[PDB]
Amino acid sequence: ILVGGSTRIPAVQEAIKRELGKEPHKGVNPDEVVAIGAAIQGGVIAGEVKD
Amino acid sequence: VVLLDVTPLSLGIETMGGVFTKLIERNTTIPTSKSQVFTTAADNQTTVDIH
């Protein structure tokens, strides 16, 4: 994955996947990526009641 | 013929976390269908599972 808005960098990126498996995951806008996750799991937490 | 003139069991579904209400009873001539409409467990049910 990736996070950390400073992470969008030429050399970090270039220098990672190569020492690693496939292409680093993208497009989720890192500086919020985490907050995004939060909200998702919250949405789910409200979506409990199925009766 | 006049066969499969009976229903194996009372069929109903999952209310209020499992409380079971009948629509179909037992003994019922098989070529039939009964219909009923429930509503929301709780405000804003984004989705409903059926059991």
Side-chain angles (χ1 to χ4, degrees):
Chain A
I1 293 170
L2 203 55
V3 187
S6 286
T7 187
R8 297 174 159 285
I9 291 169
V12 185
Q13 217 225 319
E14 236 68 0
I16 297 168
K17 162 198 182 178
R18 40 157 244 187
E19 229 288 326
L20 284 51
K22 197 184 160 308
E23 158 61 21
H25 277 349
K26 12 66 220 303
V28 228
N29 215 296
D31 9 24
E32 56 251 314
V33 134
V34 185
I36 291 170
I40 291 169
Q41 170 76 53
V44 170
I45 296 167
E48 286 181 14
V49 297
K50 300 178 191 168
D51 280 357
Chain B
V1 287
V2 198
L3 253 269
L4 271 159
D5 268 28
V6 267
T7 283
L9 262 177
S10 310
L11 287 147
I13 292 170
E14 245 247 41
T15 296
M16 212 27 180
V19 46
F20 170 84
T21 336
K22 281 151 52 186
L23 305 173
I24 293 166
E25 215 283 310
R26 192 282 285 196
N27 86 84
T28 295
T29 45
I30 299 169
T32 221
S33 36
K34 174 170 195 109
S35 197
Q36 242 311 266
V37 197
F38 329 74
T39 105
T40 349
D43 312 29
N44 308 245
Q45 219 141 14
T46 153
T47 140
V48 300
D49 221 321
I50 292 170
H51 224 8

